Protein: mu-transposase
Organism: Enterobacteria phage Mu
Amino acid sequence: MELWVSPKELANLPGLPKTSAGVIYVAKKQGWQNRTRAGVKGGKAIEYNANSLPVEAKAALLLRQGEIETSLGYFE
């Protein structure tokens, strides 16, 4: 499993501030396994590994994830 996340998506969990500015700034206070992707924004964005987020965000995370997709590229 992986389920990565984006700063704009973290800017809504309680444990995390309501603005990515605080999440990215706080990201330095720890540095959750964040993968870069030269396509979700600029030549180098900053994703966040959901498994690296604490528990307070892990709970509220999958919470606002209601409805998303059924199954695909999952090779069954």
